[PDB]
Design a protein around this ligand. Sequence first.
Ligand SMILES: *[C@@H]1O[C@H](CO)[C@@H](O)[C@H](O)[C@H]1NC(C)=O
Ligand SMILES: *[C@@H]1O[C@H](CO)[C@@H](O)[C@H](O)[C@H]1NC(C)=O
Lengths: 48, 1638
Amino acid sequence: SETLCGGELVDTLQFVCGDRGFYFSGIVEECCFRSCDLALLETYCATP
Amino acid sequence: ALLCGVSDGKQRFDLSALARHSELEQNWEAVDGSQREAEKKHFFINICHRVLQTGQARGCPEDAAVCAVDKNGSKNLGRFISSPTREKGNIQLSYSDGDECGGGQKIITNITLMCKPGDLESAPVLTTSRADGCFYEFEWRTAAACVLSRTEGDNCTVFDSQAGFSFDLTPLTKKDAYKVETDKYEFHINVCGPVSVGACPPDSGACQVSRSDRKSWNLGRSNAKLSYYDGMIQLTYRDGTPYNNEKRTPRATLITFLCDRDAGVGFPEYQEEDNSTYNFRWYTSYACPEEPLECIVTDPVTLDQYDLSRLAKSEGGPGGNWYSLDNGGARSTWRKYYINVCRPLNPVPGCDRYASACQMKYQGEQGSYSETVSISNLGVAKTGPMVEDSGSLLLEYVNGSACTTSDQRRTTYTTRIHLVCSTGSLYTHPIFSLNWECVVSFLWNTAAACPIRITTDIDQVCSIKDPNSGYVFDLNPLNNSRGYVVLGIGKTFLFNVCGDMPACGTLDGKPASGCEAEVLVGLEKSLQLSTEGFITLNYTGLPSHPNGRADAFIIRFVCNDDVYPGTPKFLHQDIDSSLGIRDTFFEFETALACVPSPVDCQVTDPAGNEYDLSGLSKARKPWTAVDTFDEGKKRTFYLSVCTPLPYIPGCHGTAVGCCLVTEDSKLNLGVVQISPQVGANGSLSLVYVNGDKCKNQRFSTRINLECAHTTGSPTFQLQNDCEYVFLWRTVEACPVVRAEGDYCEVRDPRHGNLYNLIPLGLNDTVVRAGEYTYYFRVCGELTSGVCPTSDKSKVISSCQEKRGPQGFQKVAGLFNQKLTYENGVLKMNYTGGDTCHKVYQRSTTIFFYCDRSTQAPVFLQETSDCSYLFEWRTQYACPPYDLTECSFKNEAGETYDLSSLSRYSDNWEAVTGTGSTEHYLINVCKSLSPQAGSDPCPPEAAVCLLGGPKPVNLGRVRDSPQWSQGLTLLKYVDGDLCPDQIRKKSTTIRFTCSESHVNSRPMFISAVEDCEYTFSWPTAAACAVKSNVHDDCQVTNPATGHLFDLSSLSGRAGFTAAYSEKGLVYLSVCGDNENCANGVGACFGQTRISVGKASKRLTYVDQVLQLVYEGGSPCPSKTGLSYKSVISFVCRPEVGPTNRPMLISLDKRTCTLFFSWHTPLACEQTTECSVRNGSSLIDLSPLIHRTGGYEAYDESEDDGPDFYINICQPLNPMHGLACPAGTAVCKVPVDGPPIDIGRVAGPPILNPIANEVYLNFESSTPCLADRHFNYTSLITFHCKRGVSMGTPKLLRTSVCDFVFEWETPLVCPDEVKTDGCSLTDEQLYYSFNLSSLSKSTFKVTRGPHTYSVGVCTAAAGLDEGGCKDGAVCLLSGSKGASFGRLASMKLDYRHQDEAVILSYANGDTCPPETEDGEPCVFPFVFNGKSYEECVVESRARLWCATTANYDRDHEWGFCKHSTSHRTSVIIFKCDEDADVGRPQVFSEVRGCEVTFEWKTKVVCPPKKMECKFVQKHRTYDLRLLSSLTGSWSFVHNGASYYINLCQKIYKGPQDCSERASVCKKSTSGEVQVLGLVHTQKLDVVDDRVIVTYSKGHYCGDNKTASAVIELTCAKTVGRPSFTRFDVDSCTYHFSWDSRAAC
Ligand SMILES: *[C@@H]1O[C@H](CO)[C@@H](O)[C@H](O)[C@H]1NC(C)=O
Ligand SMILES: *[C@@H]1O[C@H](CO)[C@@H](O)[C@H](O)[C@H]1NC(C)=O
């Protein structure tokens, strides 16, 4: 019923893939409005 | 003319000194020479009204004040009959008709004035034309006309608010000097600061020294009074040194600044000196006003404006910008990020001008000190808001300072700043995200960034703009359709505002306001505002005074909040028949007119029944109402009360009150102004307005609230004339009642009791919660803590605090000695602490609920009034128990106790049937917690029915009587009179097992109105045993009765698990951590996010502890889940530094944070994997991989890291491979997780037949045949020598039995002692037994280390004793490892050197390296402590450190462990001085292959020699032909042949060396000595006797000489001589005949 963006998105993002770095190519259109899962938060993180 | 000076609303500009008014010189030669062909360099422009006639300006056509001259003649481009105008931030001259165009366009020449203060030379250029020579646009950079006259300045700022061109110079200062070069005098100056050289009086600000004569003169003291001039930056100094003058003229000085676009800070320049007023012009980029890049971006795909206007921090800003922090790791790589939006910075010391985002770091910050230094400076404010996906706004700067991007070409830093939109308006900083390949990201949370409707340019007379933030309001809701009746002291006037009136509407112009004011004349409308107590509208009428204004009155409109659409209220009227104007002057106001906000909406009635609806405002989940609609998709109404929603994409507006969302279109329905009806027999209704659509019948929402007994959710009533009415019934709409008291006591809660709180206020209370910390005391006079820092006599009651950066203690409200019982809650108001952002006074408010004595409070959310909220659940505020123990713990399997299912705050109204007219309030053994909702059930009752008829009792509590072990075990005596009017309601409760983390209520089943009800709860709480074996963090092994205890590490201190470079995870065993919130075992980085709650039910599975936390933070997954964590413990059979909990992986299936760890606490079994073989102890201790596993490889396939092998421990964990904990052997598949193919079973078993050692593993997985779980795998071992300690390899595959083969030199058995320690060789044919050198432990010491060596002898001896089987031990450091096993001794001979090599093999591991291969310096210090081996702390894998102090240098690369074990090599050197010498220290190649030397005779000695030989049993004796002193000589061809057999030389010649066999004395060639008798080999052919003599001269390519001699049988000893010799074979022949040869 509820979502994550604000202070709670700037940390989970650098949690789920941590030390690879990442992008917004973007996240904030989905996880502010629709309820994302922890699959989508993987695929918006930078592939090595 | 004099129309050439323009003044704006507050300031003025004049073009005065720029124009050559009647001074008769050359005019402005407004040309640069780039392209000119007719050399039409005319452009003679006086600004006001002149042309001055001279060379190329004589014969100008005047009365135009503009020349157009050429080779072809003279023209007029423009006249001056206009006035200069204002463009965006500029002054523009629209000039008039000069001469005609070719098409008669009447040529117009525009001139633009951009101001650049400190411009004496100013020549404009024609940059742009119309391309066709009849529209000439000019750009002029002048000193003139952008500002008013001078103003004095502050400390070093010229800070003026009205003119708004507010410079600053403060980065120009320098504590060193500024050095000026004339011939014989330098000039020494630091602006706004003291002179910093010793030759000068340091009271000065500037002084010049005579560099020819070294004489100081004060050119004035330092000064801070900045003096803006009109077009100039004047700075001047104090009196200083006089010369000779009778007026004693002191040397003052004057400094001027000229703007430049790209100079920077520049050098000061000696201008001149005229009469001791010293002149210094300067080019400083800081002296120049920048332009704001316009920040309004339109919408390409739809029509919606945006706004980034008010976010630019314009002024008050010396480091007063938006700033954003980063905490991360410890006292290094901290950054504080400065950034500003849409314009360059309020200048910060040592960043830049024309930069937007300064990186700026901490230095010696500890103790309220030293904010900044500057490191890296980037960005240019270039682009502006590039809009994105309908709510989110990307924003980019470019052109920063240089960097590298993974060895790519050098590019700039690049700020991106994402602006997602939200509703929480004031005081939201950016939140730092990233520093990743020179793209510094940020993330903003909130502005009013997102919702700007274009407004579709509605221009209704009822509609007026508000340019403060950006708004238009509408009074169309005052289309009041039966008219209004105004009060009037003359007579009642009648009024509507716009578009309504029939009752006075039959006149010319269709009047909506012109009524009789008798017992009249039409009035039209035009209107205006100034937003300052002022929202007005005129009423223009027809019967005007001649050449004057008609009857036109004003209505001032201000804002009330808590009132209806309103009532016009008649401020004074006054008739004036003398003057033609006549104004009624009626002025009222309503709520519905002004800026919408969060309305604080506690409100009341005249009838004294106070209300509150703010019990509903705190909803993070936005409310929803249910609907009825047609066969298509059902609509969806969102709805809130008194507080707007979070940015639903596609319903725009400012206050989104109610956003009607279907699939297709998004209708904004409402805004936020509350006025419930309170006078009726009915109740509340609250109204939302301004849909601003629907054919001038605008949308509105009025949700209607009546009181219900239960919680509810709204619904859709009907819809008419495109407004709505809903319905919504919940508890809150019942009239609430509260009472007031004093000195922390209250009274009369409708129960007749008192409320003491001063026991809680006895000592201090610290709520160590989040980023803040609150020291406060209950019932005031807070004195203790680190905050009594104040001087004023007012009392401290509460004051918050920070950590290091600007750590402040601003005091909250003062002690006011009050509390109030408000609807079952106790709360205090603490008003009046010091100031917030704007005006706001910090108030604190402390709540109380009554509970079971849990007196640790916690702070809740921050309100908009800068207030702080607090919450306790104490044991004080609830008087009337009827309590029982409500249990039977006498027998087990009985559902023994029901303690935790009681409730005291509010109570269970059951999960009833759909369509219950009744409300079943019941809790298990407590008598009705008093709900504050409505006329209550009397609290003596425990089972009660509300809904429909009266509160009636259904029974009273009694301690549990059961009927069975299982069921029907609570019963309620003495409910009310039944239809029999005999017995009272006797009601029973049943309970049943399930598993439900949030169970249901007792489900209401039966109803027989004659005194009997039953209730059966499907519970989770029925079946368990309270004597779970410990229920603290200690567990007992079911197998052998061993006790596992863990409470030696149950700290509140916590621990650190690393998941990044810049983020930690906090962790505390069987107890709550102190950093994160209470009820949290583990929590994340920046905001404290729970993973699971701390439980102590430590289970046990398979030599592993599996502690489980559950019920943590809400997970983002498709199904509603939480995080959970399994801290899985492993036996570590030592204590090392690496025993800290490493986060091992995340699982994305159900949100599971996995956790490995280690300890020695957890192994019951003493780990030994070393077994006996008759007399020989064998061991496999050094073959344990200690840091990771080993990998058994991909086999029998291609294009695939397939097995993980660990012999007698479990394997060391490794980030990102979730092989579940305590695994010996792990198969990594190509899909899904890896699999437990065995755990470590027991000691190595033998095979008594073959003597090749097995070891086995049992599993806890089923086979692929489902055959009786017990998955097996066993490893073999194979004795075979070599250096490598070897790998596993998989050979044989059964369906569920894997067999790993292994080659290792360890299982090789120790033979009987040796053959000997003796270099027995086939070639030199005589050995060197070093049994003599088997003595004792040597001590060779060289460099920073010592050594301990021993040959054919181990020495775990005098120093450490633990170098087990160590032949070469490093005694240096602490516990230096072994180099080579004494069984693995491989004695060797080196041929060309003729020296003995002693090699050892397979000791411990060569020390580890970085990933980059730059080796480590392993006696080092981290955090004061010293360590040897690669530590895990604050990074997720092992890492060494490549400096002596990680606190100093910050160099590290990850500890990638080698498989190359250590080894050693010893050399021995022939030295005649001593038989046994000393070993020496040669080399450490990456510090493992350490090699040793010797100075010996023991390996050399040919002294005791037998040169006798037997072949085929045919013996000889040759002791006769030897010559022990002297040798027989024969000298042919000039060569002297001195030789005798199996001897040294004896009384030999000059210059032939020691132990010489043959030394030839040559004539022209060098003396060579060839042949030796220790490698001498004698043999007899059929006829000849042969011998060899090696180690002579270098013949060819590693070739030597050999005297192979012929011994034919003869009768008498002869002499040999030389037959032939070649160069290919380098062989010598000798034809000897002797008697003693055969
Ligand atoms: C509105 O009324 C005021 C005062 O009566 C007057 O100064 C002003 O000129 C009027 N405005 C118009 C547009 O008639
Ligand atoms: C120990 O094992 C080796 C390996 O084959 C074997 O040769 C030796 O005889 C064993 N020791 C005894 C005492 O049997």
